[PDB]
From a paper:
Nef affects membrane trafficking in infected cells, e.g. by modulating the expression of surface receptors such as CD4, CD8, CD28, MHC-I and MHC-II, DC-SIGN and chemokine receptors in HIV-1 target cells. The structure of HIV-1 Nef is characterized by its flexible loop regions that contain several sequence motifs as an N-terminal myristoylation site, a central poly-proline PxxP motif for SH3 domain binding and C-terminal motifs for interaction with clathrin-associated endosomal adaptor protein complexes.
Here, we describe the crystal structure of the sdAb19 single domain antibody in complex with HIV-1 NefSF2 and an engineered SH3 domain of Hck. The tripartite protein complex of HIV-1 NefSF2 (45–210, ∆158-178, deleted of the C-terminal flexible loop encompassing residues 158 to 178 of NefSF2), human Hck-SH3B6 (residues 79–138 of human Hck) and sdAb19 (residues 1–118) was purified by gel filtration and crystallized. The 2.1 Å structure was solved by molecular replacement using the Nef–SH3B6 domain complex as a search model. sdAb19 folds into a typical immunoglobulin domain closely resembling known llama single variable (VHH) structures. The SH3B6–Nef–sdAb19 complex adopts an elongated shape and is formed between two subunits (chains A and B assigned to SH3B6 and Nef, respectively) of one asymmetric unit cell with the antibody subunit from a symmetry mate unit cell (chain C' assigned to sdAb19). Only one residue, N35, of the canonical CDR1 (residues 29–35 according to the definition by Chothia et al.) contributes to the interaction, whereas the majority of contacts are mediated by residues located in CDR2 (residues 54–59). A key residue of sdAb19 in the complex interface is D60, whose side chain carboxylic group forms ionic interactions with K148 of Nef and a hydrogen bond to Y139. We find that K192 and H196 in Nef are directly interacting with sdAb19.
Residue numbers in the entry:
A (entry chain C): 5 to 118
B (entry chain A): 81 to 136
C (entry chain B): 71 to 157, 179 to 208
């Protein structure tokens, strides 16, 4: 299982920190990612943290978001700064294998207002 | 190993030594076919295409 | 007296040449943000062939969809969707994007270790 938490109501310009606890499933040799899905729209890749702890981010997410992992707990986090209404979405964690996303959780709701 | 340039070589890259036909250079390193050289005139160093030069 | 200078000596791309050339283009602002195309990359690869002698067989990227990472460790550009984001990777429009971390992190090899044996 992949169970994310941290979601809530945020004012424009505010911050939020998301967290995922991962079960199964060999974690340490897994590339991990956070994605998000707005209503009606298509899921959008947001951040990636690689097996050897290397990171990458979408454009819309810049120098605002930060993805990190902690190997002792089978856990991955997403720090989100300077939030905007268009960041509103359900955010979920996933395992990336090659070009595809192997596993993914149901996610946690982030709602940003102004 | 002193060498002279058979042709002009202009490179936009900082790691290369640009030169003109005639310019003499000292070879510091025969590292394949791209050699590290130093210009006698300016003392600037850089890589050079070995087929652009001939031994003296 | 033949007035054309010879082709500079030929050689295969290395980590360090890719790093060096990536950084040159970064300083010049040469590729950043440019929409990728087969022809543009060919001009890029042939310019490196002509000026430096590298066989133009090195500038390959992971298959996507989404960001395409360089197979050649040392090359510090990746291709990023500019109209994100599609299911068919062949329909995604990409731009070159410099990424300093690609000098230290072989992203392609971590996502696609099968390419490396």
């Amino acid at each position: 299982q992949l169970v994310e938490s941290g979601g809530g109501l945020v004012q424009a310009g505010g911050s939020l920190r998301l967290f995922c606890a991962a079960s199964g499933f060999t974690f340490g040799t897994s590339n991990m990612a956070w994605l998000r899905q707005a209503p009606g729209k298509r899921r959008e890749w947001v951040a990636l943290i690689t097996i050897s702890g290397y990171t990458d981010y979408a454009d819309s997410v810049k120098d605002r978001f930060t993805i990190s992992r902690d190997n002792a707990k089978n856990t991955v986090s997403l720090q989100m700064n300077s939030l905007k209404p268009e960041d509103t979405a359900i955010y979920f964690c996933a395992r990336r294998v090659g070009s595809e996303y192997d596993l993914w959780g149901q996610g946690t709701q982030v709602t940003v207002s102004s | 190993i002193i060498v002279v340039a058979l042709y002009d070589y202009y490179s936009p890259f900082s790691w290369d030594l640009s030169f003109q036909k005639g310019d003499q250079m000292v070879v510091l390193e025969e590292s394949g076919e791209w050699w590290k050289a130093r210009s006698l005139a300016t003392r600037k160093e850089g890589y050079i295409p070995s087929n652009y030069v001939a031994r003296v | 007296g033949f007035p054309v200078r010879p082709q500079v000596p030929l050689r295969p791309m290395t980590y360090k040449a890719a790093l060096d050339i990536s950084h040159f283009l970064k300083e010049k602002g040469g590729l950043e943000g440019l929409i990728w195309s087969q022809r543009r990359q060919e001009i890029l690869d042939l310019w490196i062939y002509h000026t430096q002698g590298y066989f133009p067989d090195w500038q390959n990227y992971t298959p996507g969809p989404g960001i395409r990472y360089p197979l050649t460790f040392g090359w510090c550009f990746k291709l990023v969707p500019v109209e994100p984001e599609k299911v068919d990777a062949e329909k995604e429009v990409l731009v070159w994007r410099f990424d300093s971390k690609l000098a230290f992190h072989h992203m392609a090899r971590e996502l696609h270790p099968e390419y490396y044996k």
